[PDB]
Symmetry: D2
Subunit: 149 residues, 4 copies
């Protein structure tokens, strides 16, 4: 069967897809490494979730990876759930500025913050939090989520 | 029941166990971050495998993590298979000197073939540096 | 008497004072580390000058320092003149928003010509990113 | 006159030259970034001085510079005097493995540790320490030493 593709993992990917869309819709998604870093540096207290996205090429972009080292360390230090994802383009397609793209749709970092408008408390958030708990409990500290696709 | 516990994952764990043991029954096996980094800087054309190992304790060790980052970026650049292990003590049960990084250098070995396939299968689903659960 | 207090250094300080003032009497002048880093990532063909500023307080700010490192390496790669200033408050007396990095973008200006010569003269003696002492 | 070339600076460069030679001779010089890092990580308590050396090319070697960020931060945090120097080859020529070089003589980091054999207390060390004090007092935190040459 497909590598890494369990029900747990299938569910995590679907939840993330949903969370990215609802977060975007509710205006509580931050897109971009520098935009994300600035929020984490200024006021991190409302970020519920972080996604780091790097393609195979991005693995040898030392600057990008060093930024990842910093964001990830910060997230761990501040108990913010964080997953890695290996398809940058798909991430961009799901969020704002996808579907075609003059100058590549390439976001390497997303923060999802709490909307509290009296808003929707997406259960997708909860499932993903559980997923990351499930990873820690098996000593996978930097968990990845695969395309259910 | 039990996150990440696949047949594939299990065969991966055993294979890394075997591989680690094959080295240590030979020179190989450069141990530690600073040791390994020079090896990569000096002679990376001969290195076949890398294992980064860290516990939850080490997530706020920015020095160690920056090095994990530089090691990982290099291996990926230079097509060395590389893997994360999360249980530093269980790794220590297989080998001494503690031990956050292991290089395997100048191979057929069912274990090495198998792990090599494991890593390509991870790449298939965009997991460029996958985690391995050691057995016991 | 007074370390680093050369005629050349003095003319450098005044020229940076003037340059900073010329911008702020214009768009230019991207302020701050995260701001500047995107600018460099996005459109570095238009950036003419960088100033990293930090105090003794900031030497153990590894986040800030890693960014100083990435900014500096980029500028050198891409031939943007870049300079270190050691008095963050005295820098603040010239410009608001506090402020560890300043980009100047899309120039003749005696100050900019002069600083451009200053930086080449630093390179002459292998000082790739020199310090400037602001006057007052 | 030559940029940066004051008596203070002329003296600093000569002192450093001397310190590199005496340290080498007394077997209390550590050569290399990884060798240096390991000493600083294991037991830093006997290192008196650090030299970081990078040529113009080295300025765009992100890995090297990140190592520099770490060594330098550590040195500042632990009050070890540290200077930067911009001629790697000359540094190598002065220390071991210079004068010709099969596979370039390229050391990017030197630590000088206390010899105490009942040994020579090089005054060059003292002058350089003073030099670095003189730099701090003028808000030049990462001081450089130029070739008197």
């Amino acid at each position: 069967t497909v590598p890494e593709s369990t029900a747990r993992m299938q569910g995590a990917g679907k939840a993330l897809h949903e969370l990215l869309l609802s977060a975007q819709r509710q205006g509580c998604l931050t897109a971009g490494v520098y935009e994300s870093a600035k929020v984490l540096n200024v006021d991190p207290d409302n970020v519920a979730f972080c996604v780091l996205a790097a393609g195979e090429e991005d693995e040898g972009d030392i600057a990008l990876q060093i930024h990842f080292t910093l964001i990830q360390a910060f997230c761990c230090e501040n108990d913010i759930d964080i997953v890695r994802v290996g398809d940058v383009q798909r991430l961009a397609a799901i969020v704002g500025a996808g579907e075609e793209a003059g100058a590549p749709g390439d976001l390497h970092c997303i923060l999802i913050s709490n909307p509290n408008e009296d808003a929707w408390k997406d259960p997708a958030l909860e499932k993903l939090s559980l997923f990351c708990e499930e990873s820690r409990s098996v000593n996978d500290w930097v968990p990845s989520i695969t395309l259910p696709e």
